[model samples]
Target chain A: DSFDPFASTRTFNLAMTDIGEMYFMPPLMEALAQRAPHIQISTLRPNAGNLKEDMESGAVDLALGLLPELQTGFFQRRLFRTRYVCMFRKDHPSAKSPMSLKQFSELEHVGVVALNTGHGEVDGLLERAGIKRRMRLVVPHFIAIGPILHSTDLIATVPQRFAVRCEVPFGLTTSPHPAKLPDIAINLFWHAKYNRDPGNMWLRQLFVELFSE
Target chain B: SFDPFASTRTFNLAMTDIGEMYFMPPLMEALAQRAPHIQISTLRPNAGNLKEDMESGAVDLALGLLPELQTGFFQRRLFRTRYVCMFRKDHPSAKSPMSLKQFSELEHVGVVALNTGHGEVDGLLERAGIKRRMRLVVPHFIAIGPILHSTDLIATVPQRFAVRCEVPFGLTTSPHPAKLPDIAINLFWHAKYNRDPGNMWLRQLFVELFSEARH
Candidate 1:
């Protein structure tokens, strides 16, 4: 069985969080457009809902991003790691000063209720330390972080890689978060059925070549 | 499963990230109040198998500017939307309803979604002999608000999405200078599920919340 990604018009479905899209998708699409010109990719949400069935049925080809719990039967590869950081506008009133846990708590914050990424640990960590951030706005994902921080006084805690991209484009700045948020590793997963699939193997290696630490 | 209201079920919805941002808040609220046990899962359409998926009930319904779903699926028009040029609120041009020349001259950030069927922008511009200065091209609307807010690059996007993006992202909209037709976002389901109770309830809910029909 010869599988050629460049010539095949196979549509590969990927499951990941929206934040994963913001970080990896642009470059992935850039590479895909050049290398696998005919192959298609559609991203699906990662949740307990149908994720297992979809991957098993081949409706979803790959799963990428952080998952706190892994099902026993899937295979996974570590792509890269990122940590959370405190992000805000470069011109915000508190921007020029140091970010202490107290100052971090005092500032208005934009909170992300990201699901399934183990981001919930941040809230647990803050509560254990007896710190409550003054949340000015809450959003579902990190997609809006760049603009929300740029034009407003709200600060956001976002992944370091995403913050790095936003610094120049969104007129943003970041400092080491006062909270000891754990580093997150972005991993790639596939069902055991696809472990030997040629096309699936190709994509796994492509991700490893492009993003592995 | 006959009683959609009391049933414990999960409905799969096909939509773009823009559609999710615009519709999900109200949709979720309605669900929480009315059908507490039911859940919604969203997925983007697969270009190769969307029809088969819908036919087999793998996807319960699709909602967006999907031209591909229009042919074989039963559809209900949810609303009419048109394109707008969105930029930062304090953009130097700072003009609402920008002239065609000004729009073509400005640097642009383009959005090219692969499977979502919102691909009319480029073709319309090309047919009108308008070549925008595309500074960057992104694959999804998830990045559009942030990109426009931070840079001077303007984007041609759906009016509904732009309106939702404006206040939070420090963005403003100008009428699209090109003569593009209004895009109809429709609720699509396979004909096989024409009288399915759960499908009927969800589509009716969407039409109630999102439809702008005066009659």
Candidate 2:
């Protein structure tokens, strides 16, 4: 009875990429609509240049996703650990159920440049492993991956969660990534200054309850 | 040769993901041909301090059906378009002209962006007591093309966006079952930058390329 989020007229400005937006916002917004109808949320693109300043100044309340740049002066809690998967059209000619690294590196790839997040480092990791990806298209955000993949022969190595989300909706299927890429530890980060703020605490706890795995 | 376009400068445009998909490719092509040294970046509607950013020249131009940037900004009408229903071309209910009854009974994928300009479709349907069977709801229109192509779920999207997705995503567009307000997309810049030469050049380029009434 003491925790009535509906009474809150406060807005929470969140910082994340499109991948984070797709993975988190739907559930978070749906929950907010049901429990805290008055509380508003605006998602801002994460800027390594300004995230620290923005969070400290309360311009951005929280940042969620695979952000490794948020190391110092920030408090972050683990939300989930996710792996990468190779996603391609369901009826691709080169589609292999248990895809090999050789076969994987041969197909054209859709490179997503999501800076300040772990996803951006994926192509580099593949290159280090001697798997040269023939990038057909490079998009700055994950939003374009679906249609591009659906229409073209390009395959995308996306977070397992996002890949699963797109599997049915985009007529795509995913296989375990042939290369051993490190698991991304998705986290919810907030400024140290807001560690004890009631609203911040409540929202963080809500995220932990809803997503921590 | 006196080339005014030789200056190397970066311009930041403010728009949603929808605007980026529709406008960016062509704009990039235009910039490459006209001003090879000029760079471009995009700031989404969710960017913090949008009004202040526009005023301070942190953002050069804003586009699309922005109703919020009216008072403190000067706008030029780019084009006007209406919403249309989009579904996979081979959908079972496919016909030359879709009926309101078929449209109402079909499952839909809803796009719910709080700050964008094109939210009137749902409101009009709601006002008309035409409740659709919403199968899924997404915050952005970026993935609607692929989703509609794969699923039986139909979506009501801008006419131009639907047309753009038809061939690439194998989608079909039909008139909406209900009357929806047409969206008048505009080019917005702060009144403070009303006379700035660079801003004027950029906005004029967009107007000429995309504006319907351009003669």
Candidate 3:
């Protein structure tokens, strides 16, 4: 038998959530190519509708995001966590320091609806406290918020990093919201099948290491 | 002396199967500034999923890749279609121009799985009777970026889409392995409202716009 076990042999499909595309994908791909030269890897991106079903049905080998609370049959690993901040134009009439949820409600807010429905965790918390704010407009992604914030008097609550990005050039300001919202932790998810496979183990280890770096 | 007439204003949702992010933000903004008198306009994406969106009474119009018309729906033209194959230029024994057999034998391939209608490549691969391991299956075209960048996995995509992403990323495209079937993107609307003035106006606008755009 003329075969070389050390040489490149098998390929694995690494299914990931769309958010992974921004920060995690480039490093993960590079790590996989370097560490698992023999084992080829392909990345798959699933939308919100089929993401859960794909993972459960073994269509996707791995999932990445703020791992959903209902972890019924999947393994999880925390990659990183980030906090939220309120964003508004520097000259916005309603902009306030240590912005209270009460003042937040009165101001017309720009909302970034990443998913189909439901407000973000900050808004959810505000709702729990019986404070329903006026969402003056709903845009799809955070990137779009830059222009709206720059041109309008509306304020928006967003992730800290995203808020910083918006604040500098867009002439926006970031202040801590008075409401206490849960911190978001982006986690790595995988199916049970690859829990013990050496190749998957190596890939996951590489992801954890890269994120820690 | 003043003349009085009843205003024929209606508050109806323009539900479409197309994703809102793709068109809503810009389109609605334009509409809002252009036609302020219109009572309300909302752009819903995925519109309760593609199939249900079209058949259900909720969606007034649907922009889909196929003419999967139920008995009572009318299909209108939207865009022409084209195809591209995804393969690495450096793969061993990979020929200058890929043949169907060679494509099917490739160790890894990426596919955009069909949610409602079959893609041109899917049909071609089925007919060829060569099913390589579909190493990755994505829901949207944008997701193919990381895959194409990282691995040897190849995919067949729409020509316009591939051209948009190819040279900048150092990826290349060739004609599809087989004489692939052509696809036409058609807009489907429930036939019940075809005679309504507003609906007819929209349909005419869509047809005229797409035809004129040479898309």
Which structure is stronger by DockQ: 2 or 3? Answer: 3
lDDT of 3: 0.57
* Best DockQ among the predictions, by candidate number: 3
The TM-score, computed over Cα atoms with residue i paired to residue i, of candidate 1 is 0.58
Which residue pairs in candidate 3 collide? A8-A38
Q: Write the per-residue lDDT of candidate 3 for residues A28-59, one digit (tens) a residue.
A: 54465555445545566444447667766655
Predicted structure with the largest TM-score when compared to the true one:
3
Colliding residue pairs in candidate 1: none
- Regions of candidate 2 where Cα sits further than 4 Å from its true position: A1-117, A120-140, A144-213, B1-5
Please provide, for model 1 over A1-213, each residue's C-alpha lDDT reduced to its tens digit, 9 standing for 90 to 100: 457977977777777776676666656755765677666566666874688888888988898887656577799988988888898888887654348888888776666767557675676677787898765455556665675576566688888887877787667888888887788878999999989999999988888888788
lDDT of 2 at B93: 76
What are the chain A TM-scores for all the models, listed individually?
0.93, 0.91, 0.67
lDDT of 2: 0.76
- The structural similarity of chain B in model 2 to the true chain B, as TM-score, is 0.93
lDDT of 1 by residue, B1-215 (tens): 45656776777777766776677656755665677656565655652378888899888898876777666689888888888889999888858988998987887767776554467677768988998766455556886766676656688899988977787568999887888888778888998998998888888889899988865
Cα lDDT, model 3, residue A98: 84
Per-candidate TM equals 0.58, 0.60, 0.62
What's the residue-level lDDT of B41 in candidate 3? 30
TM-score of 3: 0.62
**Overall lDDT per candidate, in order of appearance:** 0.75, 0.76, 0.57
lDDT of 3 by residue, B7-90 (tens): 223223333222222333343344333333332233344334544554554555666554445678777666665667765445
